[PDB]
Symmetry: C4
Subunit: 196 residues, 4 copies
């Protein structure tokens, strides 16, 4: 039984590897053997895990450019089949389910902050002949990187008022992200301790 789980983990990792290397600038045969093993384990088994197992085989069987791009993207959900064997990943999923409202609150706070600071920086920088931000939508990426402290990169053309707005954005993002996490973290600690 444990050998079968080892084989399944090996197949999952091999599928992930082959997907990454086929995206590099044969592979189809290995993918076919992976999908045969996936459907064999699906049939033997026959929940969120079952749904993930269903999704891991659909893009293989299905095969507009947008539809092809979408199916290739959803093909990556093989990585979530590790939840059957990994116990920490199950804990993470349980924690996300038990802190979905807090996740929504985080997304709402980020949305409010990003729209506010994007409008602020766009209007503060619109008083120059050469404008760094063409529009408020053009500044959402800047606002999200400043609030997440990821960093925009080159901020030289931005003027003094834009820099003040950016400093406020950095501080506010730090605060508004530090607020709702020590609830998701507490749920994760609870679930992780309960499991082990």
């Amino acid at each position: 039984a444990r050998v079968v789980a080892i084989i399944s983990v090996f197949v999952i990792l091999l599928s992930i590897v082959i997907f990454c290397l086929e995206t590099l600038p044969p592979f189809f045969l290995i993918e076919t053997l992976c999908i045969i093993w996936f459907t064999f384990e699906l049939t033997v088994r026959f929940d969120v895990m079952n749904v993930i197992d269903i999704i891991a085989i659909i893009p293989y069987f299905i095969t507009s450019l947008a539809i092809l791009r979408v199916i290739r993207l959803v093909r990556v959900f093989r990585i979530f089949k590790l939840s059957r064997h990994s116990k920490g990943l199950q804990i993470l999923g349980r924690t996300l389910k038990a802190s979905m409202r807090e996740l929504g609150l985080l997304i709402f706070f980020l949305f409010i902050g990003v729209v506010l600071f994007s409008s602020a920086v766009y209007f503060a920088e619109a008083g120059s002949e050469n404008s760094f931000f063409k529009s408020i939508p053009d500044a959402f990426w800047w606002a999200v990187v400043t609030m997440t402290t990821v960093g925009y990169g080159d901020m030289t053309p931005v003027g003094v008022w834009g820099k003040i707005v950016g400093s406020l954005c950095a501080i506010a993002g730090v605060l508004t992200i530090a607020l709702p996490v020590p609830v998701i973290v507490s749920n994760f600690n609870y679930f992780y301790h309960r499991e082990t």
Copy 2:
């Protein structure tokens, strides 16, 4: 009653969307219908929420370039009308009110650190023919991004002493920002738990 709240949330989101897309490189009619609904709900209702409702209509009725830029900026405060319907945003406002002194302490610590490290980096880098920072005021943005860990970008022209100052600035900003947050976070957790 709940349908009216749904309509109000839809109108608020539509106003936000139309404001963002009119800043892109019709809209006035939709904004007029939004402001009519806003004033209708204001009159039916007739606190911080009431003040926010007042501010959401003033820029429409009002209409120097600076004054126009300022009124367009304050027009973004429609997003804060969501506090009536959202409960987490009310919790955030209550937490900010109950941790205003800690917010002030954070701003004071950031100000002290930024002035200190800006002076340090400016003087450490003034001993070269090509100076990366023209003045101490020119380095406040660098100090704020280094202390917030947002990141300045390209730091190549800065010399060895400037790099030492930047390393000290990064460490000190990490410390001085991690200090006063686990008080605002505690207030937010208290208020959020009390509400739910």
Copy 3:
């Protein structure tokens, strides 16, 4: 008595402002009045605060290029005279005194991580004709920004092994900085609660 404290805070802020604007691309008279008030309060008073008061006047009275640069840099310690009037800054100083060993531990951990990852990235990137890092000392700044999550900037010339080293450096810096802070933070919370 409170009016005198208000005057002292105003003079301190005015000195800070005039120092920043004289570093911009008259001022001496205002600085002279500030130093006269500083020495008047020093004489009336006549501890770390007293030492800070002593340092705030020495650079004025003193006036190699290095010595001049050093005295101008130490002239910035006027900002620390706010400790007499501010209570949070006193708490910060007390917390630093009571968590000096933890500060030293943080500096030691950062030093170990920076030397390790600088050596790693330098050796991983030395196998190319165009080397991004000339030496291990040349990579300390990269290591400190990666470990503090400030960000180096452009990392394109760095090869695959260098990128693996950088990913390890980022993770290790996150961990090694998150470790010794929840002790300094606890000391700050203790002192801040005790004061108020």
Copy 4:
């Protein structure tokens, strides 16, 4: 006895310094005296510390380009001999041993997030003539810097969908890194308090 420990710490620091300066664009004699002292203390002593002492001398005695690069890299493990004299570093090692499973969980979460977001950004950006990411493997560095909030640098060529993926990556990395650390931190606090 304490003088011998002081001498050992001085020799360790001198070896680290000489290694860094010989990597700059004599040294061998100082390194020889360092290795003689290292083997003298190893013989007098004659555990992880003993293994570290063994590794600190092997590269000196040993002397393909890859093998030479590897031995020079493993030569840096002199810095870990400070564990005998430093007590905080021993605490760090004990904490890592007692939170190895949590470290593995962090690496697993980072791996899942990085593969997911690298695939997402590669597919979102493949619909343009000029593609910012050639392949999914080419985007792992971007995913790791975005998830660690280190920052990639210049993100201008990336399109709107890529920017949405990057925002999701930043938020998810913040969450997935904040989750498993308040366990390693707790172990470190426990061990540090127990030692002192």
